Amino acid sequence: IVGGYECKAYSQAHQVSLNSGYHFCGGSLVNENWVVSAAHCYKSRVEVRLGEHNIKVTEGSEQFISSSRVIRHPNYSSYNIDNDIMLIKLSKPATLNTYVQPVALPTSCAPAGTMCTVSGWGNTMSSTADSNKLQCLNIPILSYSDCNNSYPGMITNAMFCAGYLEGGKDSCQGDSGGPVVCNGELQGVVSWGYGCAEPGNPGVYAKVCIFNDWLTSTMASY
Ligand SMILES: [Ca+2]
Structure with missing residues (x-):
């Protein structure tokens, strides 16, 4: 994180x-x-x-x-x-x-704008953030258009983008497989991205719903 x-x-x-x-x-x-x-x-x-x-x-x-x-x-x-x-x-x-x-499995798919929590023991890219103790982050679900814009033609129906296009905050390697919880249900699974917390490269998640x-x-x- x-x-x-x-x-x-x-x-x-x-x-x-x-x-x-x-x-x-x-x-x-x-x-x-x-x-x-x-x-x-x-x-x-x-x-x-x-x-x-x-x-x-x-x-x-x-x-x-x-x-x-x-x-x-x-x-x-x-x-x-x-x-x-x-x-x-x-x-x-x-x-x-x-x-x-x-954690309960999602009834329905959360729409763009929903604020969620991602957590993990992955890379923090910070001297000050100890990856040995569970790190938390709130990230909003991005729209499909912002997602597909970031990774043209690489987004399937089983994926959604979440995070910040400006960068600075994201999940990272080591966080993979982890939860994306929105309103108490498991909406995503940490999957991939280009680098970590880079501008224009938001995190991509498996779409559990x-x-x-x-x-x-x-x-x-x-
Ligand atoms: Ca322990």
Whole structure:
């Protein structure tokens, strides 16, 4: 997260760290057994760390659970990073408490102008911002025209832009797979962008509201 603020410890209870010897992506707990991330974060096996604030310090709030299965969207395509969503089945259910809570899947798509929160342990491009403690950022959803203008012809129906065309504030590498929460629901998944927090290069997110049929269909296929 570039230009954000350190989140109030555990204010983002659904936030998870994806770890394979080190933090490499984020994810969102959507229920006791499932995590939503980015298909570009795919690994056949990962350890999901819940209840985290400072990933480098044991706090007593964490839960480490290995995955029983990692399922990328059947239509994911890397050359254009389309359908950049993945489901992770936990090997054992998370324990919900003061530190671990799921985030609800969107009923409907949020329109342009909606103010949202993005969080993560990715690069902050700041000496002063410690990526080891969860960073938060409020970003507005951009219009389709501003989005397509920024990345001509590269925006599909499974993407939306959010952030600031002037730059300075954005998600960054390491934040990928993380949540974009708007009015208490998971609207996006940190996906891609050109650089981080650069003028004219807003962040691009996977558009969760068009994947609801696939998501629920899969969560019912345990
Ligand atoms: Ca910790």
